[PDB]
Amino acid sequence: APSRNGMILKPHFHKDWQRRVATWFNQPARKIRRRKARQAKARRIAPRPASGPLRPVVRCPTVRYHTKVRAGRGFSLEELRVAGIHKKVARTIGISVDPRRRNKC
Amino acid sequence: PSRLRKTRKLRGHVSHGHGRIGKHRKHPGGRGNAGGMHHHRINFDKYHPGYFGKVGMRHYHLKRNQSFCPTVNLDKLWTLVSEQTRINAAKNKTGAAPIIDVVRSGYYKVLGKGKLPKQPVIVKAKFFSRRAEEKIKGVGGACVLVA
Amino acid sequence: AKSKNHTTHNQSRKWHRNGIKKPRSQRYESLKGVDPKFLRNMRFAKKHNKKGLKKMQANNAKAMSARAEAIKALV
Amino acid sequence: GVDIRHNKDRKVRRKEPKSQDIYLRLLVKLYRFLARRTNSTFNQVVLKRLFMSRTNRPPLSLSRMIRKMKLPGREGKTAVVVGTITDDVRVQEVPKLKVCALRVSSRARSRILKAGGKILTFDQLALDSPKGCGTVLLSGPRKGREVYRHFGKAPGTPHSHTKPYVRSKGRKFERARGRRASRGYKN
RNA sequence: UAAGGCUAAAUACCGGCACGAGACCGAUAGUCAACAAGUACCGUAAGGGAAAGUUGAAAAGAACUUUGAAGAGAGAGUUCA
RNA sequence: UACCCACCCGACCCGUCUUGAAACACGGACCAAGGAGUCUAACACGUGCGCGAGUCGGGGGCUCGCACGAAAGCCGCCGUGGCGCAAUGAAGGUGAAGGCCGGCGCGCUCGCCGGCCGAGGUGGGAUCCCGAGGCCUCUCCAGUCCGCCGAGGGCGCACCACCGGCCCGUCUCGCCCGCCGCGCCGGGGAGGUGGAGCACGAGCGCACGUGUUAGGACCCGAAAGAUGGUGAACUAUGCCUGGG
RNA sequence: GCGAAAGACUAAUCGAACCAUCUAGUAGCUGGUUCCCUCCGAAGUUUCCCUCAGGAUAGCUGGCGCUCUCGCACACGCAGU
RNA sequence: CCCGGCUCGCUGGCGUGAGCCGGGCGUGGAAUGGAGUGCCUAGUGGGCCACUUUUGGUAAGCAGAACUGGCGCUGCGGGAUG
RNA sequence: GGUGGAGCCGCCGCAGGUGCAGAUCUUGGUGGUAGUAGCAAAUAUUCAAACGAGAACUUUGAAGGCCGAAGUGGAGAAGGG
RNA sequence: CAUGAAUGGAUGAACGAGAUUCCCACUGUCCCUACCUACUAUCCAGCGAAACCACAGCCAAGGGAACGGGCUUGGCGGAAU
RNA sequence: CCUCACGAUCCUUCUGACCUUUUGGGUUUUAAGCAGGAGGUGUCAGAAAAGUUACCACAGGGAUAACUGGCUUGUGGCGGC
RNA sequence: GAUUGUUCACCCACUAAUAGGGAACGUGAGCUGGGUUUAGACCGUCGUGAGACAGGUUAGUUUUACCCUACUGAUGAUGUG
Ligand SMILES: [Mg+2]
Ligand SMILES: [Mg+2]
Ligand SMILES: [Mg+2]
Ligand SMILES: [Mg+2]
Ligand SMILES: [Mg+2]
Ligand SMILES: [Mg+2]
Ligand SMILES: [Mg+2]
Ligand SMILES: [Mg+2]
Ligand SMILES: [Mg+2]
Ligand SMILES: [Mg+2]
Ligand SMILES: [Mg+2]
Ligand SMILES: [Mg+2]
Ligand SMILES: [Mg+2]
Ligand SMILES: [Mg+2]
Ligand SMILES: [Mg+2]
Ligand SMILES: [Mg+2]
Ligand SMILES: [Mg+2]
Ligand SMILES: [Mg+2]
Ligand SMILES: [Mg+2]
Ligand SMILES: [Mg+2]
Ligand SMILES: [Mg+2]
Ligand SMILES: [Mg+2]
Ligand SMILES: [Mg+2]
Ligand SMILES: [Mg+2]
Ligand SMILES: [Mg+2]
Ligand SMILES: [Mg+2]
Ligand SMILES: [Mg+2]
Ligand SMILES: [Mg+2]
Ligand SMILES: [Mg+2]
Ligand SMILES: [Mg+2]
Ligand SMILES: [Mg+2]
Ligand SMILES: [Mg+2]
Ligand SMILES: [Mg+2]
Ligand SMILES: [Mg+2]
Ligand SMILES: [Mg+2]
């Protein structure tokens, strides 16, 4: 029963929400489960970039994110036989290899 | 808190703020926005004019990134640049007209609102307004397009 | 289940409790509702008052100095 | 056996700041003193403002403070705002000002000092001009809040344009029965 | 680049094993269940399903005398009580 | 004042629905303990606080085995992003400035070139400023200090009323166009009208209150509907085999 | 299902069994709705509704304020006249 | 209110008219009282009675309106009781 | 003041499952009714003794009686355990 | 009003815990009640419930939610059973 | 001559602009828009809708009947001038 | 007294007369249960049908007093040493 100049308010609670409510009291303990892994992995591969292999420079697709630059998935193949690094070897020297990137420029 | 709630001050008050003539029954009007046409019309029609009915043209699978286009007014153009590059002008006796890359500050369009300081400029943007053209031109300066 | 059908019983009380207010009228009421050929003209009269301000300003000093002379001739 | 309406005999105005900030309660202790004593209605307005709410003593932009000090004659006086001085990025020729305020945003604080100006607080203003001599009282636009747009007659009553509350504006959100003459009617 | 296939990691856990904690409840509350509780008990059966915590610090839990068929008493004694 | 008793006056039993209850209206033997406007989300306005054309906050990250910690602190993360900073159209799309002066096109209320000012004006406007004149002061006069009163005169916030102006949609009407192209090209004008618009801003976040909803939703209350199951030990028939 | 037919009977249950769940089903309708003091204080009328035991909107109510006025020898404004 | 003057694409033999700028002038019947304005918003939406007016009805403690006043929301003195 | 035997409150802030006379409220307890209604379907008991603290009601003896072999008699099924 | 032919019409021996009417016989059904018996109730020993209950319990009239126990005015009122 | 002679959303159709979209470009169909008319809701602010229950059920209602009681007294009865 | 569920009615007979009424249209924990007014049935009419019928017809559970009062009887009661 509306009264005097509110909004229209379609709120989505008709279905059954009480059952599938996901509370986040794990949140601060998950911060810690990941932190140990992040550390335990760095100590396991001791001399190695903890962040992981090297990713390539890459531009974002749509016209609104035109001008930014990202870390891509992996260096392309066409890139590699210019620098002279065999595609199967680079996977073993910390170079992400993406065999799926069409180079246009 | 429960401490500062009118439900405390309604103890010993029989009807509990809901009146004993017409009690607080469960759902007297309806449930939710129900009855816009029927018996709630006076509300929907006098407070939400234009609610009920179709209009316009469907455009299925719209994506916002296609039509993304922020705007600057000339009101605040010399804000995008550090003000010292403006002070290192109106001076320098050479017609320096520093370059303002409206693209770098995140705007794909320059609109002509407000006064502009009497100062030469080069404004690089994507889409210009007509009056924003004349305001920059007439101050002395260029409008340079970028893709 | 018959019921009363109408009444204006204590209605006079209600709408006189906040004391029926004659609508507060300002000077300069709105021109909305006046025939367009009036406005479509009187806006041109108002738009070009300035063209002819020189006549108005000098002719103001004429009477301002003639009545500064009229009040000084009385003195 | 008397016949007055006690409906609105009690006058509803603030006689103390509803807030607890000891600082505002302190210079209220100052103009609870000046207001009773000196003939100046000045502080009687300053006092009657130190009570009011955030929503009722709006911020004064810096440019609206210029064009109210540029007027012919009010040169040499001090601007006095029971409120905050904000900055105005769309203004550059900052004349030298003497301002008083409760707060001054940090950016506007440096535009004012750099222009050879001075900012006081409402206790140095009490020592400058306890009578309020040579001052200018100002305020921001109280009909400035976006709230004031949803107020008025109603949206949907004849030619009374007032913004309606809509969860999100768009094509299909309230352009229908009542807005286009083609679909029902329009007002 | 379909019509064939394999794959760790972040992801989920009101069952289970083993723990830790609490601005929680405190015996009509908190789980039905602080106890021989999914027990006693009902129903042909599917199923239903309780009540019920506290002597004292230590049993030192009242020997003995007496009245009574006996239950119960009167004295005595134990006890900080 | 509270225990018992006495007297004079008063005095019908509470809760409830109700035009009307002491009611020949209903609930109520008595006493203990239990017992009913809650939380979440979403708006809205009011209020407090931080910062302020910005401001966050989340998720992440960097710092612990937590005792207090599953806290606190910190991070071009702080802006990826939301909300705000700009509207208007169904949409292609456009998009908030005017004034003035001089000069040049025939000042043609049209088009172009140089300079000045910059958010227009009217009426109220808290109200500050200036203030004629007074009002004394132990003398006649002179005269600088100090205020009180102060006719009259000025700037004029906020806000309200109005007139203008600009943006977009639509219409009308009419003019000149620019020319990387050709004009079923694009561009400007005047007048009216639609707009949740601009016309030197006020938001963001965090609290608390009130209200409205969606939620079991202030507590208790149906006759029903659905999905799976267990029953012929009673009784209803049929059958099989016995007994009277 | 079964009925030599009464809607009979189907484990004290039959115009449609019992058990658990969906389930805190829905209720414009009954019933209840827990401490004091202080200040203000109504309505049963308007239009629309498959509206007539209900809502929507009007009023009437309160709270919050604000804008000013001047009893500070120096007031405009309003009104159930 | 009274003068003076500008503006017009309307109106017209001229003037109208309206709009502007600029000056010139104060208590305009009695009695009362500080006024203006914006936000949220609960309850209510079964009513009843009396003077007077009045519609059905024969009449009603009947049905239905007007105007005010009450009762509901409210005790006290009086009407024995209400 | 008393009994009671181990913990508790004042102030400044924060948080609630926070105040009961009532709901044919829930659970438990207890009255008035009241020492009242009642212990009335199938004819029936009596004497003496024994035992015993205690006998209308047990046991033995004696007497009167009923069930009357389509049984209140003698044996089984199902069921009970 | 509004019968009627297998929505069967008309008949009808026997039969009926089927519905009526009349007569004979009979009778405590009645005029009109009376007494007799058994078991009760009744009192006692023993044992002992329940429904129900705002507070409660003498009337007339008045008013009143238009039939009071309570209120107004009268009438009156004597423990425990 | 004046005061009545009429109709929302959605949907459908017709008409209008060398209109806009038809989605990676381009051309044609087609469809979707925009602006006006029409197709209709007579319960006329606009549900797509027949019964019966004496086998019945639930929520309620003295807001709504069938008894009594009140007020009234036409009618009925009784009585005057 | 005859008929009738009847109030009402009509007659027979007697008489002095067979006047009219109230008491919740007196009186169901006083009776009876014939009539209405459940469920079974039967006809007529109506209804396409389920069914309807102040149209007939037959069959159809009538609970509780021990409480207070009133009343009827029954003991008593304060006073009178
Ligand atoms: Mg990573
Ligand atoms: Mg109250
Ligand atoms: Mg209530
Ligand atoms: Mg594959
Ligand atoms: Mg216990
Ligand atoms: Mg306990
Ligand atoms: Mg328990
Ligand atoms: Mg114990
Ligand atoms: Mg205990
Ligand atoms: Mg002790
Ligand atoms: Mg009533
Ligand atoms: Mg009564
Ligand atoms: Mg009731
Ligand atoms: Mg269904
Ligand atoms: Mg009701
Ligand atoms: Mg009501
Ligand atoms: Mg009535
Ligand atoms: Mg102990
Ligand atoms: Mg708690
Ligand atoms: Mg309690
Ligand atoms: Mg025999
Ligand atoms: Mg044997
Ligand atoms: Mg007896
Ligand atoms: Mg294609
Ligand atoms: Mg039938
Ligand atoms: Mg039947
Ligand atoms: Mg009634
Ligand atoms: Mg009657
Ligand atoms: Mg009777
Ligand atoms: Mg009786
Ligand atoms: Mg009876
Ligand atoms: Mg009968
Ligand atoms: Mg029958
Ligand atoms: Mg027949
Ligand atoms: Mg037929």
Q: What is the DSSP string of chain B?
A: --TT-TTTTTSS-TTTTS-SSS---S-SS-SSS--TTTT-HHHHHHHSTT-SS--S---SS--GGGG----EEGGGSTTTS-HHHHHSSS-SSS----EEETTTTT-SEEE--S---S--EEEEESEE-HHHHHHHHHHSEEEEE--
Which amino acid belongs to residue D158?
Answer: P
Residue with tokens 């153009």: B77
Give the residue from B18, B24, B31, B33 with the most A CB atoms within 10 Å of its CB, the best one to mutate: B33
B126: its two tokens: 């994507």
Distance, in Å, from the CA atom of B137 to the CA atom of B112, rounded to the nearest integer, reads 12
Q: How is D30-51 classified by DSSP, letter by letter?
A: HHHHHHHHSS-HHHHHHHHHHT
Distance, in Å, from the CA atom of D102 to the CA atom of C40, rounded to the nearest integer, reads 51
For residue B34, what are the CA distances in angstroms to A1, B54, D132, D165?
A: 8, 18, 60, 18
Other C-beta atoms lying within 10 Å of the C-beta of residue D182 = 10
- Structure resolution in Å? 3.7
Structure determination technique employed: cryo-EM
The answer to whether the beta carbon of residue B58 comes closer than 7 angstroms to any atom of strand I is: no
Question: Which nucleotide's C1' sits nearest to the alpha carbon of A30?
Answer: F70
Distance, in Å, from the CA atom of A97 to the CA atom of A105, rounded to the nearest integer, reads 19
Determine contact, residues A1/B28, Cβ cutoff 8 Å: yes
- Give the DSSP letter of residue D168: S
Burial D157-173 (b: 16+ CB within 10 A, else e): eeeeeeebeeeeeeeeb
Does the beta carbon of B54 lie under 8 angstroms from any beta carbon of chain D? Answer: yes
Q: Do B66 and A62 touch (CB under 8 A)?
A: yes
Question: What is the number of residues in chain C?
Answer: 75
Give the residue from B37, B55, B67, B78 with the most D CB atoms within 10 Å of its CB, the best one to mutate: B55
For residue C35, what are the CA distances in angstroms to A87, C40, D160?
A: 84, 9, 21
Q: Do D90 and B48 touch (CB under 8 A)?
A: no
Distance, in Å, from the CA atom of B17 to the CA atom of B8, rounded to the nearest integer, reads 11
Q: Is A39 helix (H, G, I), strand (E, B) or coil?
A: helix
For residue B127, what are the CA distances in angstroms to B9, B69, B108, D120?
A: 62, 9, 6, 46
Distance, in Å, from the CA atom of C30 to the CA atom of A92, rounded to the nearest integer, reads 83
Report the run of H or E that residue A70 belongs to, with start and end. strand A69-71
Residues 6 or more apart whose CB falls under 8 angstroms from that of D95 comprise D66, D69, D70, D115
Closest CA to D61 of D116, D112, D125: D112
Report the separation in Å between the CA atom of C14 and the middle of ligand 5, taken as the mean of its atom positions. Answer: 62
Q: Is D151 helix (H, G, I), strand (E, B) or coil?
A: coil
Distance, in Å, from the CA atom of B82 to the CA atom of B103, rounded to the nearest integer, reads 16
B4: its two tokens: 């500062």
Report the separation in Å between the CA atom of D12 and the middle of ligand 22, taken as the mean of its atom positions. Answer: 104
How far does Cα C21 stand from its chain's mean position? 20
Residue with tokens 């440019």: D63
For residue C67, what are the CA distances in angstroms to A81, B106, C64, D171?
A: 100, 65, 5, 66
Residues 6 or more apart whose CB falls under 8 angstroms from that of D114 comprise D94
Distance, in Å, from the CA atom of B32 to the CA atom of B40, rounded to the nearest integer, reads 11
Other C-beta atoms lying within 10 Å of the C-beta of residue D126 = 19
Question: Which nucleotide's C1' sits nearest to the alpha carbon of C17?
Answer: G60
Determine contact, residues D173/D187, Cβ cutoff 8 Å: no
**CA angle centred on D145, ends D143 and D150, rounded to 5°:** 90
Q: Do A63 and B66 touch (CB under 8 A)?
A: yes
Report the run of H or E that residue D79 belongs to, with start and end. strand D78-85
B141: its two tokens: 């300066």
How far does Cα B142 stand from its chain's mean position? 29
Chains contacting C with at least 3 CB pairs below 8 Å?
Answer: none
Q: Do A64 and B40 touch (CB under 8 A)?
A: no
Distance, in Å, from the CA atom of A85 to the CA atom of A90, rounded to the nearest integer, reads 6
Helix ranges, A8-103 (H): 27-44, 77-83, 87-90
Q: Which residues of D touch A4 (CB under 8 A)?
A: none
Rounded CA Rg of chain C: 28
Distance, in Å, from the CA atom of B53 to the CA atom of D36, rounded to the nearest integer, reads 63
For β-strands D135-138 and D78-85, DSSP reports them as parallel
Which amino acid belongs to residue D141?
Answer: P
- Give the DSSP letter of residue C50: S
Distance, in Å, from the CA atom of B135 to the CA atom of C9, rounded to the nearest integer, reads 68
For residue A96, what are the CA distances in angstroms to A58, A87, D130?
A: 13, 10, 74
Distance, in Å, from the CA atom of A68 to the CA atom of D101, rounded to the nearest integer, reads 43
Determine contact, residues B105/B126, Cβ cutoff 8 Å: no
Residue with tokens 């397009």: B145
Residue with tokens 């290192």: B88
Residues 6 or more apart whose CB falls under 8 angstroms from that of D163 comprise D149, D150, D155
Q: What is the distance in angstroms measured between the alpha-carbon CA of D87 and the sugar C1' of K59? A: 67
Distance, in Å, from the CA atom of D178 to the CA atom of B52, rounded to the nearest integer, reads 9
CA atoms within 13 A on the CB side of A41: 9
